[PDB]
Design a protein around this ligand. Sequence first.
Ligand code: K
Ligand code: K
Ligand code: K
Ligand code: K
Lengths: 292, 292
Amino acid sequence: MFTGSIVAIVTPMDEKGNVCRASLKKLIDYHVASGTSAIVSVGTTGESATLNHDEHADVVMMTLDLADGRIPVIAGTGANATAEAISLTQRFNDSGIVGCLTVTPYYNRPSQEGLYQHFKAIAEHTDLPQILYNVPSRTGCDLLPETVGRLAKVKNIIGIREATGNLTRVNQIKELVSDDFVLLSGDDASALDFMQLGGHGVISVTANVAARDMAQMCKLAAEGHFAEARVINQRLMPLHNKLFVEPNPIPVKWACKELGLVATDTLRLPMTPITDSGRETVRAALKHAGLL
Amino acid sequence: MFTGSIVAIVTPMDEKGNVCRASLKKLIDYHVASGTSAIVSVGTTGESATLNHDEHADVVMMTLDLADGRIPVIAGTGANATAEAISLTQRFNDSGIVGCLTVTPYYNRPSQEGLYQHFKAIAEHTDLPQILYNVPSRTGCDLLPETVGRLAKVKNIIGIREATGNLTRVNQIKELVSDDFVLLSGDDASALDFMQLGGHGVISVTANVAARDMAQMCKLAAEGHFAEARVINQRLMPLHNKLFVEPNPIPVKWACKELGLVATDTLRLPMTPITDSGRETVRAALKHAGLL
Ligand SMILES: [K+]
Ligand SMILES: [K+]
Ligand SMILES: [K+]
Ligand SMILES: [K+]
């Protein structure tokens, strides 16, 4: 699945900062029961930044195993060095994951030509479907619609997760690619708008704690019932905003613990524990969404 | 040494992308002869992004070996996971490097508290001097003067390379830290302004190809001879700008190749070869500087 509500799943940890299997299983069961369409394993929200490649791969394989064919699993495979992106991608070749979510190189700020070569080379070393991931606020780099058009011509580059919050990109990209190229929002607060413009779903942080509502919202969207979808969206809007009151995934992990979905809200440095003021902010948004 | 002109040195490569010892030796002899204060080894301009930690450490050790006590060497040691930063730092214990240049975590966008905890932990676990490195355009986060002030109180956090190009930061930081805390520009085009406002030196990309002029400009600035320094700066200003006409270090490696300082201008993906228009823009900047 590359449609509907796709969760950017947290990597729940024990107090030592290592993956908590019991909490992972609980989350995956919750997504299966909630109608979540797919899981992105070890992306931004899953702390790809603070896991090494072995630990990253371990979490993905554990997620795939625990999913047990019940829900598709997409691996986060981003790296800012092309050779490393290829190497990470190869760990999942012939694994059971359905596709990869691959971010524009961060920090080194490649040109649009460099982005084209990075993703082309990655695609050439895999049989897995590739979803491009654009998030300039984290990367320092902006994959423009014209380059997306170029890359969409590569056989196994099948979609884009667009996290700019710039809604004009939907139709600029759609104009330049074929009808089957998947357009996914990477920005919860604008994701319903993104779908109203022609987007096919959302890779969502909110879905971590509001999976049923999120799944319902995207289904309504896909059927053209936007007024009905907006009612849910307004119920979820404080979460769409306040889950970033502190650096993601600090708030969403606390929210998961609060809802009893994970054993601990532990994260790896440089992410730090949620402040007291942060707890109260997220608690009120959970209450507004009617989740407590 | 942590004042004056400090070169953010390129990592010269053969056609296969592997470090070229003979080109590195030439660059190092050139900086020894040209009065450069120190070499930053495997930072941003050194393609830290696309070397693994083993190649990274190899290049630094080779740099120390070739320098042979003639010029101080500072290692780039930045990482977006604290544990990984600490691990990378350990590789350089008793190596002979004089200090480390450590970037704010990129991509994961930690809070000021997270940044504080990050750099505090790195400093705790080494005796090597640490220079903080702030470059929001690359990292997606901004180490603010208040937090720099908190970190300056750590015994072995000794300075900051400020690459915002925001010159108000010089005196906002200076007011908060003791008089021996080193303030270095990380932005060639505003570096002389930075030094006129109280800065102590520059970590420079332009110094790769204009080492002597850079060294003299920084000495004149340190002596208060700002008009004299600005004459040199005006002839280097096209280089300060045009070395970023395409993504750094693409133009500067081409320039080094053109001057005969390195054998090839090869980079690793996602960095791609300089375009022809780039060649001419950079060629013209070199001629304006008197280098061709
Ligand atoms: K990582
Ligand atoms: K395609
Ligand atoms: K690296
Ligand atoms: K200090």
